[PDB]
Amino acid sequence: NNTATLCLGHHAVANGTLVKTITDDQIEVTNATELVQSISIGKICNNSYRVLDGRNCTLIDAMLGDPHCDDFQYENWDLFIERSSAFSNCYPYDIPDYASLRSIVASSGTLEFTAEGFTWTGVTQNGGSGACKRGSADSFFSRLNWLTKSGNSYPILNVTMPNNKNFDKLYIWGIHHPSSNKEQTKLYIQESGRVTVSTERSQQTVIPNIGSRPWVRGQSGRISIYWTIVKPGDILMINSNGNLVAPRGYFKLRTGKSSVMRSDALIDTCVSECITPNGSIPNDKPFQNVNKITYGKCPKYIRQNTLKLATGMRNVPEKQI
Amino acid sequence: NNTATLCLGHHAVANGTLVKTITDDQIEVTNATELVQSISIGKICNNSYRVLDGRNCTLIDAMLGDPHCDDFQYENWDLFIERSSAFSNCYPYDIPDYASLRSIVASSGTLEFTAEGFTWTGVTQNGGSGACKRGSADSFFSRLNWLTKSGNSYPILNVTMPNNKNFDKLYIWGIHHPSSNKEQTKLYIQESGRVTVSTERSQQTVIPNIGSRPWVRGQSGRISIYWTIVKPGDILMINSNGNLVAPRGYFKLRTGKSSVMRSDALIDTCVSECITPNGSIPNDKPFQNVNKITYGKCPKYIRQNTLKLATGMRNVPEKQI
Amino acid sequence: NNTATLCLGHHAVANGTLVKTITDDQIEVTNATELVQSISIGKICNNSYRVLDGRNCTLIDAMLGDPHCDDFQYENWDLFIERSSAFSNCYPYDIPDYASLRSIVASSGTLEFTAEGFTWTGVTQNGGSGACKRGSADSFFSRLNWLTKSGNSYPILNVTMPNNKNFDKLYIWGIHHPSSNKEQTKLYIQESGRVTVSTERSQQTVIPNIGSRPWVRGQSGRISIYWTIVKPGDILMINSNGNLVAPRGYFKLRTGKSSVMRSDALIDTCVSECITPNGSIPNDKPFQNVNKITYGKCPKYIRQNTLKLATGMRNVPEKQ
Amino acid sequence: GIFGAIAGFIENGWEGMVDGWYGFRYQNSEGTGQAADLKSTQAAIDQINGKLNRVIERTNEKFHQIEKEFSEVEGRIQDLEKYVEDTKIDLWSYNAELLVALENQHTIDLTDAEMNKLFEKTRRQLRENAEDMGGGCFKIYHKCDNACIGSIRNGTYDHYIYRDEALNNRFQ
Amino acid sequence: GIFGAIAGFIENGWEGMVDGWYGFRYQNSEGTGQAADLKSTQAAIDQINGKLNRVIERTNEKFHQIEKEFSEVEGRIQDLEKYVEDTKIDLWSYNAELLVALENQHTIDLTDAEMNKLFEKTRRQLRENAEDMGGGCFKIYHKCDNACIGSIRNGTYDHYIYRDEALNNRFQ
Amino acid sequence: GIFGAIAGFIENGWEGMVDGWYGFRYQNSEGTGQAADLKSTQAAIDQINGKLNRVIERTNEKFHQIEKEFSEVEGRIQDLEKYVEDTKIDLWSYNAELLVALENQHTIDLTDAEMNKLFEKTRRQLRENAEDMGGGCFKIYHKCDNACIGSIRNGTYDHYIYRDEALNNRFQ
Numbered sequence A, B: 001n002n003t004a005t006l007c008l009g010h011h012a013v014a015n016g017t018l019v020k021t022i023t024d025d026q027i028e029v030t031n032a033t034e035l036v037q038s039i040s041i042g043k044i045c046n047n048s049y050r051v052l053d054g055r056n057c058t059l060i061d062a063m064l065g066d067p068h069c070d071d072f073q074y075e076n077w078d079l080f081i082e083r084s085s086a087f088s089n090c091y092p093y094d095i096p097d098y099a100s101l102r103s104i105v106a107s108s109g110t111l112e113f114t115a116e117g118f119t120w121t122g123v124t125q126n127g128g129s130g131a132c133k134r135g136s137a138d139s140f141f142s143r144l145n146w147l148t149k150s151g152n153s154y155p156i157l158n159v160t161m162p163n164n165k166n167f168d169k170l171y172i173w174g175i176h177h178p179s180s181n182k183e184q185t186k187l188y189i190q191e192s193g194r195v196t197v198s199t200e201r202s203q204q205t206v207i208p209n210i211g212s213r214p215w216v217r218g219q220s221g222r223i224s225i226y227w228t229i230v231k232p233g234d235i236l237m238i239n240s241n242g243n244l245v246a247p248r249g250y251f252k253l254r255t256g257k258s259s260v261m262r263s264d265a266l267i268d269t270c271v272s273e274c275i276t277p278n279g280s281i282p283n284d285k286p287f288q289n290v291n292k293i294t295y296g297k298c299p300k301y302i303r304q305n306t307l308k309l310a311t312g313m314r315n316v317p318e319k320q321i
Numbered sequence C: 001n002n003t004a005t006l007c008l009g010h011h012a013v014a015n016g017t018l019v020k021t022i023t024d025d026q027i028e029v030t031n032a033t034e035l036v037q038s039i040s041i042g043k044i045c046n047n048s049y050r051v052l053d054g055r056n057c058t059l060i061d062a063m064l065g066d067p068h069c070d071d072f073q074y075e076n077w078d079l080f081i082e083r084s085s086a087f088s089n090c091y092p093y094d095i096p097d098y099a100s101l102r103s104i105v106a107s108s109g110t111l112e113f114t115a116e117g118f119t120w121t122g123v124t125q126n127g128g129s130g131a132c133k134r135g136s137a138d139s140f141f142s143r144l145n146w147l148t149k150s151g152n153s154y155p156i157l158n159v160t161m162p163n164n165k166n167f168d169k170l171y172i173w174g175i176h177h178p179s180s181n182k183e184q185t186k187l188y189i190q191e192s193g194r195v196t197v198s199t200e201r202s203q204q205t206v207i208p209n210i211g212s213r214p215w216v217r218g219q220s221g222r223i224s225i226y227w228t229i230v231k232p233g234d235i236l237m238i239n240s241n242g243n244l245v246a247p248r249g250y251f252k253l254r255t256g257k258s259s260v261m262r263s264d265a266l267i268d269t270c271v272s273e274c275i276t277p278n279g280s281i282p283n284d285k286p287f288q289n290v291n292k293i294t295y296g297k298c299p300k301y302i303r304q305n306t307l308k309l310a311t312g313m314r315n316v317p318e319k320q
Numbered sequence D, E, F: 001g002i003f004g005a006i007a008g009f010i011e012n013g014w015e016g017m018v019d020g021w022y023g024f025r026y027q028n029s030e031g032t033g034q035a036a037d038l039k040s041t042q043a044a045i046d047q048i049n050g051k052l053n054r055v056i057e058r059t060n061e062k063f064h065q066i067e068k069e070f071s072e073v074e075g076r077i078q079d080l081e082k083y084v085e086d087t088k089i090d091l092w093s094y095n096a097e098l099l100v101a102l103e104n105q106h107t108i109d110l111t112d113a114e115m116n117k118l119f120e121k122t123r124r125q126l127r128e129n130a131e132d133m134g135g136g137c138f139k140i141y142h143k144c145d146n147a148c149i150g151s152i153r154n155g156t157y158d159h160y161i162y163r164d165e166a167l168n169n170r171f172q
């Protein structure tokens, strides 16, 4: 014997997997890994971020102080969760540019409220309604103050509050739209009311519109909600001759990592740094196909449900004949 | 003979073509194909999508019932074309957030209108105007009801209209701004008009403003147009003590694949799945430099007017020394 | 002998530089170059673009004609610089959609104002205030005309001005909100004011609101500023029975390459075509990490502070 | 190219080879001739059709969108509308530029490689019966008529038939 | 593949090679054998692990953003919110498609190259003692027992020891 | 590298070669020497310079844009303005990262390839007068003085002149 044969080669597997390349739509490699997260844990994990269940309250109603949302009073969150079963149970109201108020509050992350000593001399305070039952009593939004005539008259209110703090103050205030002319004169004496809220740099003026609107929770009138942000060094001023829904204090505005999300998912104990409305997802892969709405440390949303990254050579199995 | 020569080679062409690489701005390959669509058919093709020519009408004018736009009454479109020679020819008007309403109607793809039995008692309906002739008689916008004083009065109108359908209703309404103090009392009795259109979820109040504006088609006054969307389960409610330009009914809101485009290009028989204002374009290439405005299955707009993809090897022609 | 040895090789350097590749986080190459501009010149260079220092004046206040901004009347720019120490010193005001007006003027690049001869019958022109002093005299915004009652009356004003030019006119006008009832009637006769500014295409109406606002330079009342664009062939119309703060003319709107930036940086002579609030930066690199806010011919902003592009082979030093 | 064949150790291309991308020229006992290799021509064509299919006939359908031209000055929200469109266009333009640059580098390289693989395939068949002359030519050291050449072209040439003849011609 | 070895001049892979990605099959005076080559296996694995680490587990943290679903019809500004989101999603979708196409092309090519390198390293060691049979096989023209084969697998084969024997067998 | 020369069958680089990127070290009848190869050095430099120009080529001129920092809290439209900017920056940041990774992989590979081409160019010229000793070295089996080495470097070396001398030294 005086020769030998030496052959070079490479491995192959029984079950390879197809991937895409620059030149081929499908070509078989020995192994691949999935880069698209397309399944969700099914629930929202509360161990990495502070997730708050809003239950039957919108963030807005909880801010306003709708009786059935009382327990949300000094609550904070990283993510606030809005249920599609949420409902308002106070006076019928509407908020011009609602979306912005919701966003501002959501971002702030807290509902911590600070009462201030507004003096309303010559008017009675703490007005309530049948539409807004608290326990068993006719009541109102805990953060708002319904002002009406004090026996005899309703004088021109002229109130100021300095912002000597070092953060922006958010003030919530409004106006009552009466359903009839005698309702207007019964509560506020004057035939046509007004609210002006101003600072050194901004002014807002609102005139009520007396009249009937569709019947809601007993009421034909409305309450319009507005907001004002007062900067450090500036001063809030409230000028009115009637129909004022007064503010009781301010919410503290924090620049933060907080948000709100609409979900009906279960909320439980697990670990995950990425929240979608479908529930949490792992973030081991760089891309996801679960939902374009996400919060946290998340793979990027893409339209593809699958993308395979080759982790092996071209698979060329032995001839089967 | 006891030997042979065997040479290996590749082809080359007389006229090659320059392409771009990672390392070269311009290098010659045997063949390339163009990846940027930069010429247009010259006209808009009407076979793939339903393209409706607007002629002398804007979408808004057609919706409103400007007499010269009567032809567009129940029409639909995938794409509605607006011509630069369009014109209004009814009562002079403006719409606050004109652009949004145009968008909402464009997207809806239809002017399906359904009249409703609104009861306006104590006023006279169907006002006309020398600025809005229908044929040769003083008329108005077809989908609008010009309400004025009946007898010697104009009572506080109060009208509801529930939405017992499984879709959103688009209601168009408005107000008349008179150009003189007497014209106000002459038409509407009261010195100040007011319109409140409401739902269980929203409200709009408009106040007319008396005074002269520039002369257009005999008219010194104006009509401001507004809109209201009523949801399933909700109820439209209208309150007016004067100046109401009443809705005759509703447009149906379909969420669809429709749009509007501004173009002066001819519309003709041909097939193409991509529409630009310059005309239709082929969609074999993945990119285009014709126009950033497009509708349909289109190559993506880029700034480059040419991009060659090499489809051959490097070209190395024979020497001619 | 009857043999030779011929060895093929490549160069190396004593100390190379680390780069990222598709497969390696850090691998050593002979040479590399930085792709991210991460330092700035420290000041805004004023030789490539016309850069105008606003000093104590916001662009808006310069436009309106705040007396301490008078110097800005005949001025144009490529880039207007607003300093954080700018202040207002006229009648206390507000502008709904302030930001849009700031944007429009900024973009236009000029404060060239063409005054027009409006006719104002039955009213007194040129109102002034203690809060807006020009020298020792009670004065006002130089581009605005504070109209008040004359004799017993203030008539319903009805004034027009055609646009016979081939460009868009920008008109700045406003309304006065008095602090009290007797101040309303003293100045305007009528009990409630109104301003309607109209064209053929558009209309704006504003109502004043009487009442107290916080004290600003002696003033409890306010002025609200609005604007109207008139198109070639159109006509501007102004109707008012009181409270009108009249326009004196128009600004010429250009579609331009102009802008405004907030910066407290020094402006000096030097060479650069890219301006950031931190100062100008060179543009020999395709990316920059200095500021997302830029003007001019600029590298693109990215979050990375360094990115090395290899400019030589893998470095394999001689060993031992 | 990265493989050093096309515009490399092969001096130039053949304008006269109209029947394929790669091939042979030869001189033997019967004269001269030229023939294309179909398998390497096809390997290259297939890959390039691959690229072409991933890039072409792939457009997306978009419907109603934002406005992109305006007849009035408006300020803040027109500004954003414009900025959004300008941002989108620049990013796509960058994708377009990069894609074509990368594809083209790769296409030049993959065709270069095919030239090299054909050269090596031939060297393998010839074993000790030929030497590399440079310029992509082989000196075959035995009589090799059209059938012999044919078998090289078919890839069924058997070096053992000619080895003695060729070894003898190669050495002395 | 661009290097022409895997699914090229090597006809297929070996399903029974379970302890490496590249290696050797041999027949000599002691029987027939198979052996994994660790160095080439590890070189491919490291490269692929590099790719994996650069792509995998590096997500950004994002917090409050824009809305993306709507209850009411609104027009201008909702149009913009949707177009902005749609634009973002298409651009990332493209990034993901390209990334995977480019990586995969490169993974197939880098693994092909390792095979070719291992083959070339073998040729260099063997010098004038072996000839290329084709199919990725050498004919070693001398007695070469498991230890001899061992020295080739180990990179310490000394051609000089066998040269006389092998030259004798090649040319007679 | 994908070609297996630099950091491959060439053990290390030469710090002492300061006038070129690639080249020759040799030992012959006239002594031991070093010389740079200009053609391969330039081929690599040209390609790198090409990249470098291509990356700076098209830097945009932008003017008025959107606001990107804010004094007051505003909600919806400010959320959209910030989200647009944040989306933009992230997409460019990705572009930048991917560009550098691809380019650097490609620069390492193309420099590796140049080393390999130079080796193969040398092998072709030498023909039957030399053998590959590994490590990037050839054993040349004939007296080869500086002019001879010169002709190899010049690409004008004529193997016929030395063949008998070399063939004899190789075998016997």
Ligand SMILES: *[C@@H]1O[C@H](CO)[C@@H](O[C@@H]2O[C@H](CO)[C@@H](O[C@@H]3O[C@H](CO[C@H]4O[C@H](CO)[C@@H](O)[C@H](O)[C@@H]4O)[C@@H](O)[C@H](O[C@H]4O[C@H](CO)[C@@H](O)[C@H](O)[C@@H]4O)[C@@H]3O)[C@H](O)[C@H]2NC(C)=O)[C@H](O)[C@H]1NC(C)=O
Pocket (backbone or CB within 6 Å): A179, A211, A212, A213, A214, A215, B158, B159, B160, B235, B237
């Ligand atoms: C302009 O025009 C509108 C249209 O008429 C007027 O608005 C109506 O005003 C009345 C005020 O009394 C409203 O009547 C109330 O309706 C409620 C309806 O909700 C329930 O009932 C039905 C089922 O029958 C369902 O909608 C639903 O499931 C609810 O269960 C009733 O709850 C009220 O009924 C109570 O009061 C009446 C009268 O005292 C008693 O008969 C009952 O015992 C009961 O306790 C109530 O009748 C009506 O809903 C309003 N319609 C709308 C659309 O708002 C405006 O008043 C008018 N404007 C002016 C200024 O006059």
Ligand SMILES: *[C@@H]1O[C@H](CO)[C@@H](O[C@@H]2O[C@H](CO)[C@@H](O[C@@H]3O[C@H](CO[C@H]4O[C@H](CO)[C@@H](O)[C@H](O)[C@@H]4O)[C@@H](O)[C@H](O[C@H]4O[C@H](CO)[C@@H](O)[C@H](O)[C@@H]4O)[C@@H]3O)[C@H](O)[C@H]2NC(C)=O)[C@H](O)[C@H]1NC(C)=O
Pocket (backbone or CB within 6 Å): A038, A039, A040, A277, A278, A290, A291, E069
């Ligand atoms: C996480 O949660 C989200 C949100 O719920 C889920 O997203 C839904 O996914 C489904 C399944 O693909 C989507 O269904 C598809 O939409 C069509 C309707 O289009 C519009 O629908 C509403 C308009 O009211 C919009 O929200 C939406 O964006 C579209 O504009 C359906 O008609 C299609 O389903 C099929 O319908 C008919 C039935 O007769 C079939 O014959 C057709 O072949 C067709 O396939 C279509 O598949 C749905 O739109 C998504 N919702 C949203 C809000 O995006 C995710 O799936 C979920 N992820 C999980 C669980 O992993």
Ligand SMILES: *[C@@H]1O[C@H](CO)[C@@H](O[C@@H]2O[C@H](CO)[C@@H](O[C@@H]3O[C@H](CO[C@H]4O[C@H](CO)[C@@H](O)[C@H](O)[C@@H]4O)[C@@H](O)[C@H](O[C@H]4O[C@H](CO)[C@@H](O)[C@H](O)[C@@H]4O)[C@@H]3O)[C@H](O)[C@H]2NC(C)=O)[C@H](O)[C@H]1NC(C)=O
Pocket (backbone or CB within 6 Å): A158, A159, A160, A235, C212, C213, C214, C215, C216, C220
């Ligand atoms: C509705 O309610 C508001 C709030 O009470 C009333 O507005 C106040 O009106 C008073 C009286 O005009 C204002 O006071 C005057 O303005 C200046 C205030 O200065 C502020 O800042 C300085 C910093 O240097 C501090 O000293 C000071 O604490 C304030 O914070 C003062 O400078 C004025 O002083 C001068 O007046 C006296 C005589 O009055 C002169 O002899 C001196 O020369 C002296 O310099 C003066 O006190 C007060 O600022 C207003 N507050 C606000 C928030 O606007 C409204 O008038 C009221 N409206 C109605 C219709 O009733």
Ligand SMILES: *[C@@H]1O[C@H](CO)[C@@H](O[C@@H]2O[C@H](CO)[C@@H](O[C@@H]3O[C@H](CO[C@H]4O[C@H](CO)[C@@H](O)[C@H](O)[C@@H]4O)[C@@H](O)[C@H](O[C@H]4O[C@H](CO)[C@@H](O)[C@H](O)[C@@H]4O)[C@@H]3O)[C@H](O)[C@H]2NC(C)=O)[C@H](O)[C@H]1NC(C)=O
Pocket (backbone or CB within 6 Å): A255, C038, C039, C040, C277, C278, C289, C290, C291, F069
């Ligand atoms: C060009 O000019 C800009 C503008 O000045 C400079 O950017 C600033 O860079 C500094 C230093 O990096 C930043 O300061 C850091 O801010 C953190 C808070 O972030 C918020 O702060 C305000 C909120 O009011 C906003 O302006 C801002 O956008 C953020 O929302 C602080 O917490 C940092 O302190 C801490 O940083 C690290 C964090 O990991 C900690 O570990 C340390 O303990 C440390 O204390 C820090 O103060 C500043 O926010 C930037 N400003 C803006 C507006 O973006 C550029 O650097 C400059 N470029 C040059 C010169 O090249």
Ligand SMILES: *[C@@H]1O[C@H](CO)[C@@H](O[C@@H]2O[C@H](CO)[C@@H](O[C@@H]3O[C@H](CO[C@H]4O[C@H](CO)[C@@H](O)[C@H](O)[C@@H]4O)[C@@H](O)[C@H](O)[C@@H]3O)[C@H](O)[C@H]2NC(C)=O)[C@H](O)[C@H]1NC(C)=O
Pocket (backbone or CB within 6 Å): B179, B180, B212, B213, B214, B215, B220, C158, C159, C160, C235
């Ligand atoms: C406040 O001042 C306004 C500005 O002056 C007043 O408006 C003007 O009022 C007059 C009389 O009512 C209008 O004249 C009418 O319009 C046309 C003229 O317009 C054009 O067309 C004709 C014919 O083709 C042509 O001859 C002209 O040259 C014009 O090109 C006449 O044909 C009519 O018969 C009629 O006289 C003015 O047009 C109008 N101008 C504007 C800008 O509005 C306004 O009425 C005043 N308001 C009050 C309450 O006093």
Ligand SMILES: *[C@@H]1O[C@H](CO)[C@@H](O[C@@H]2O[C@H](CO)[C@@H](O)[C@H](O)[C@H]2NC(C)=O)[C@H](O)[C@H]1NC(C)=O
Pocket (backbone or CB within 6 Å): A031, A032, A033, A034, A311
């Ligand atoms: C083929 O690749 C897959 C990926 O789907 C491997 O599975 C994982 O590989 C990663 C990276 O090496 C590691 O985190 C783990 O070892 C595996 N984890 C999980 C959870 O699956 C798989 O091991 C590979 N198969 C072969 C034969 O190499």
Ligand SMILES: *[C@@H]1O[C@H](CO)[C@@H](O[C@@H]2O[C@H](CO)[C@@H](O)[C@H](O)[C@H]2NC(C)=O)[C@H](O)[C@H]1NC(C)=O
Pocket (backbone or CB within 6 Å): A046, A047, A267, A268, A269
């Ligand atoms: C995650 O959510 C779960 C589910 O509600 C919370 O755990 C429950 O909390 C209630 C509060 O009254 C307890 O009575 C239950 O015993 C808990 N059940 C389970 C299954 O955990 C939990 O508090 C949340 N975790 C965090 C860290 O916030």
Ligand SMILES: *[C@@H]1O[C@H](CO)[C@@H](O[C@@H]2O[C@H](CO)[C@@H](O)[C@H](O)[C@H]2NC(C)=O)[C@H](O)[C@H]1NC(C)=O
Pocket (backbone or CB within 6 Å): B031, B032, B033, B311, D052, D056
């Ligand atoms: C140059 O390349 C183009 C691009 O592939 C070739 O054009 C194709 O040719 C076939 C056959 O004629 C057509 O049916 C295809 O529609 C064309 N495809 C495209 C994308 O244009 C062309 O054949 C090549 N030119 C030459 C001279 O070979």
Ligand SMILES: *[C@@H]1O[C@H](CO)[C@@H](O[C@@H]2O[C@H](CO)[C@@H](O)[C@H](O)[C@H]2NC(C)=O)[C@H](O)[C@H]1NC(C)=O
Pocket (backbone or CB within 6 Å): C031, C032, C033, C034, C311
């Ligand atoms: C390696 O690259 C660096 C770039 O970082 C080069 O240093 C530069 O020198 C050239 C002169 O033509 C210019 O690009 C710059 O003046 C220098 N750059 C900087 C940042 O200062 C240098 O060209 C290269 N070095 C070697 C040894 O080739």
Ligand SMILES: *[C@@H]1O[C@H](CO)[C@@H](O[C@@H]2O[C@H](CO)[C@@H](O)[C@H](O)[C@H]2NC(C)=O)[C@H](O)[C@H]1NC(C)=O
Pocket (backbone or CB within 6 Å): C046, C047, C267, C268, C269
């Ligand atoms: C660019 O900025 C510099 C500095 O502000 C200007 O030049 C200075 O002008 C002042 C008076 O206006 C002189 O006292 C200085 O001598 C000048 N130079 C320096 C270095 O301070 C210059 O005018 C500005 N504008 C342009 C267009 O170059």
Ligand SMILES: *[C@@H]1O[C@H](CO[C@H]2O[C@@H](C)[C@@H](O)[C@@H](O)[C@@H]2O)[C@@H](O)[C@H](O)[C@H]1NC(C)=O
Pocket (backbone or CB within 6 Å): E146, E147, E148, E149, E150, E151, E153, E154, E156
């Ligand atoms: C190199 O390998 C030599 C060859 O013999 C052995 O090969 C081994 C890989 C293994 O399979 C053994 O069973 C063979 O007998 C060996 O003699 C040397 O010890 C090795 N030396 C070094 C320095 O690596």
Ligand SMILES: *[C@@H]1O[C@H](CO[C@H]2O[C@@H](C)[C@@H](O)[C@@H](O)[C@@H]2O)[C@@H](O)[C@H](O)[C@H]1NC(C)=O
Pocket (backbone or CB within 6 Å): F146, F147, F148, F149, F150, F151, F154, F156
């Ligand atoms: C190529 O080289 C031939 C060899 O002579 C040269 O050797 C080198 C050491 C060189 O630097 C010179 O000193 C010698 O001339 C030479 O005879 C040929 O003339 C050269 N031909 C070309 C075309 O360059």
Ligand SMILES: *[C@@H]1O[C@H](CO)[C@@H](O)[C@H](O)[C@H]1NC(C)=O
Pocket (backbone or CB within 6 Å): A015, A016, A032
């Ligand atoms: C097929 O391939 C995958 C590898 O990802 C894995 O499920 C397994 O190895 C194979 N399945 C079976 C049933 O053999």
Ligand SMILES: *[C@@H]1O[C@H](CO)[C@@H](O)[C@H](O)[C@H]1NC(C)=O
Pocket (backbone or CB within 6 Å): B015
């Ligand atoms: C140049 O080449 C094209 C194919 O690329 C061919 O069709 C054309 O005939 C050539 N030009 C001329 C003038 O023949």
Ligand SMILES: *[C@@H]1O[C@H](CO)[C@@H](O)[C@H](O)[C@H]1NC(C)=O
Pocket (backbone or CB within 6 Å): B046, B047, B051, B267, B268, B269
């Ligand atoms: C274009 O569109 C319509 C609808 O299909 C069709 O009736 C018409 O004939 C087409 N061509 C022209 C010239 O109108």
Ligand SMILES: *[C@@H]1O[C@H](CO)[C@@H](O)[C@H](O)[C@H]1NC(C)=O
Pocket (backbone or CB within 6 Å): C055, C056
């Ligand atoms: C602005 O004016 C004040 C005095 O009114 C002065 O102290 C300040 O330094 C000035 N700044 C500039 C840039 O002119």
